[PDB]
Structures are given as C-alpha cells and as structure tokens.
Symmetry: C4
Subunit: 92 residues, 4 copies
C-alpha cells in the first residue's frame, strides 16, 4: 500500500511537470504552473470533463495531446483502483 | 457496515455545515443553506461536474477551495467504495 | 445474478413510469414518454450530467425532485456494482 | 487477462469502424475518421459527457443511436472492470 501511494505521488509529480512544460503557455488557466497542473491532472484522474472540458480544447492546438492524457488516465485510474482495493484487503 | 454508514453521515453533515459557512454568501445557489450544501456535496461525491461546474468557479473567489474539496472527495469516494464492498462481503 | 438483473429491469421500468408521469409535461425532451425516460434514467445511472444537466434544471420547477433522483442513484448504482461483481464471482 | 485485453481491442476496433461509417458524415469532429472515432469511443467508455456531449446531439439526426452506444457502454465498461479485477487477482 505504502509503495503504491508513493508510486502515484511520483507519477503525479512527473506528469504535472510535463504538462506545465507542454501546455502551460497555450493553456495557462489549466497548466500555467505546477500547482494549476496537479489540480487539473487530479480532475482528469476523477474523469470529470476530461475530454470535452480539457483534452479536446488542448488538441485544437496540440493534436497529439491524447498520447499524454489517455496513458495518464489508464495508469492513474488503475493505480487508484489498485490502492483502494489494497487498503481494504490489508484492513481485514 | 453500520459504523461505516454512520461515519459517512457524520462526515457529510460536518462538511455541509463547513461549506454553508465558507461558500454560502459568495455561492448561494450551491451552498446558501445546509440542504443546498448536502445536495451539492453529494454531486461532488458522485464526481458530477465537481471541478468545471463547482470547484473552479468557487476558486476564482476562494483560491484555496481545493484544500476543502479534494480531501472531501478522497475521503467520501473511498468510504462509499468501502461501504459498498462491505455490504456484498456480509451478504455472502 | 438472474434475480439481480431482473430486479434492476423492474426498478428501471417503475422509475421510468414514475418520471414520465412526474416530469413529462414540464421537461418533455428528457421525460416526455417512457422511452425518453428509460434513456434519461440510464444516463442518470452512469452519473453523466445527472445534477448540472438534469436534476438542478428539474428542481427549479419541482423543488423536491432530489427525493426521486438521489434514492434512484443510490439503489441502481449499488445494484449494478453488485451485478457486475456477481458475474465475475460466478465465472470463476 | 491477455484474452480479455485482446477481446477489448477487437471490440474497440469494430465499434470505431462502425461509428466512422454510421456518424462520420453527419458528426465529422467526433467520427470523421477511425482515429477521431477510437478517441470518442474511449471518452464514451470513461462515461465523460457520453449523453449530453455526444449521444443526445447524435440522436437529433439518428434517433436510434442509443442501440449502438448503450450496448457499447454496457459491454466495454464491464470488460474494463473485469480486466482491472483480473490483473489484481493474478498479481496476488
Ligand atoms: C494529488 C492531488 C493534488 C492537488 C493539488 C492542487 C494544488 C492547487 C493549488 O495549489 N492552487 C494554488 C492556489 O493558490 C490552485 C491552482 O489550481 C490554481 O487555480 C492557482 O494556482 C491559480 O493561480
Ligand atoms: C445525501 C443527502 C442529500 C440531501 C439533499 C437535500 C436537498 C433539499 O432538501 N433541498 C430543499 C428543497 O426545498 C434542495 C436544495 O438543494 C435547494 O435546491 C433548495 O434548498
Ligand atoms: C436499461 C437501458 C434502456 C435504454 C432504452 C432507451 C430507449 C430510447 C428510445 O427508445 N428512444 C426512441 C427512439 O425513437 C430514444 C428516446 O430517448 C427519445 O430521444 C425519443 O423518444 C424522441 O422521440
Ligand atoms: C484507446 C485508443 C485511443 C486512440 C486515439 C487516437 C487519436 C488520434 O490518433 N488522433 C489523430 C491525431 O492526428 C486524434 C483524433 O481524435 C482527431 O482529433 C484528429 O484525427
Ligand atoms: Na463517475
Ligand atoms: Na460532468
Ligand atoms: Na462524469
Ligand atoms: Na466516471
Ligand atoms: Na460530463
């Protein structure tokens, strides 16, 4: 559980650094600084307006944006699901 | 199961009192009274428009709003997942 | 599994009859006929725009609409979760 | 696990070919080519704006669109849930 929660924190920090760098200048409200980025990636992780609200507008400037966001979702939504199950199993 | 469902009710009532107090005057449709608050926090819990629809507009007035909402989500979405699993395990 | 899937079909049909009757005349695009109702309740079940898109607009006419929709969500989202888990357990 | 992930890839490719053909000319931003289709169906699978954002606008042109999209959701959202559970079980 401890290693999974740490893996997620490292993945969240690398992705938020990458997103700040990639989409900060073109999309500043969403990825203008590491903090705006970390908040956005969390929203993307919960699946809230990920495509209509974030990814589709980003793609009109960066057509390949899906290469970053889709894997991010596939990885984080899996890790979170694994972490939540891991806590319950250990609690029993 | 009984203790988990009671923990959630107490957490939902404390958060809806806190939200009424914090964002009631600035965002009255969403947190103007305990009832509007309880309904909103449920919507936030289901993840429906949590960021684009509620949290981002709230943040333009209260920049730290994420300190309240993100933990609320992390706690309630975990407890609900734990409660739903708990019912099935006991049913077997 | 068979009894759970049948319970859900009966619950979906009763709710879609109730919604047609309650919100059909005031909200015809969403609940104007049993079929429009069944499609909407499915959208509500998946959690897609349930509050911002459906429930909040319905509440401006019917303030208690939450007494119908919130329990519907709590019941159907639990039954579906139970049904999906039930299929996997039986498959092993 | 390997057979489930392969089943999903085949289902995603058949559906994205079908959607290109069915709704490409009438809805080109969403289904104009196999790639736009694959990206959209993924968004539909995550449940993000599936009805308000995609299915309801598509239905104003193609009233039966629900015969394609609802089963697609029921199948893919089940397979993904089964695949994610399958990985954890094998990991133990
Ligand atoms: C794991 C999940 C971690 C989530 C961390 C979110 C951090 C958000 C934050 O620190 N903000 C700074 C608050 O000052 C809010 C920003 O999203 C942004 O709105 C502002 O930076 C505008 O400026
Ligand atoms: C989980 C608990 C959810 C409780 C929701 C309570 C909603 C309620 O009682 N309202 C009062 C209905 O009069 C609706 C409010 O959200 C607001 O719209 C008007 O207050
Ligand atoms: C369990 C999930 C069951 C879902 C069943 C959906 C049925 C939808 C349907 O039969 N429609 C009629 C298609 O003609 C579409 C309607 O939602 C509506 O848009 C039309 O009735 C407008 O007229
Ligand atoms: C799960 C698989 C998801 C694959 C998405 C593929 C998206 C893609 O290749 N695009 C082409 C990028 O050139 C983006 C399209 O969705 C569209 O916007 C332009 O086509
Ligand atoms: Na959801
Ligand atoms: Na939404
Ligand atoms: Na959603
Ligand atoms: Na979701
Ligand atoms: Na949405």
């Amino acid at each position: 559980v401890g290693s999974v929660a740490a893996l997620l924190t490292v993945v969240f920090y690398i992705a938020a650094v990458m997103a700040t760098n990639l989409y900060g200048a073109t999309f500043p409200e969403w990825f203008g600084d590491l903090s705006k980025s970390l908040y956005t990636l969390f929203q993307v992780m919960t699946l809230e307006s990920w495509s209509m609200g974030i990814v589709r507008p980003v793609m009109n400037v960066h057509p390949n944006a899906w290469v970053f966001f889709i894997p991010f979702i596939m990885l984080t939504t899996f890790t979170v699901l694994n972490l939540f199950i891991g806590i319950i199993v250990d609690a029993m």
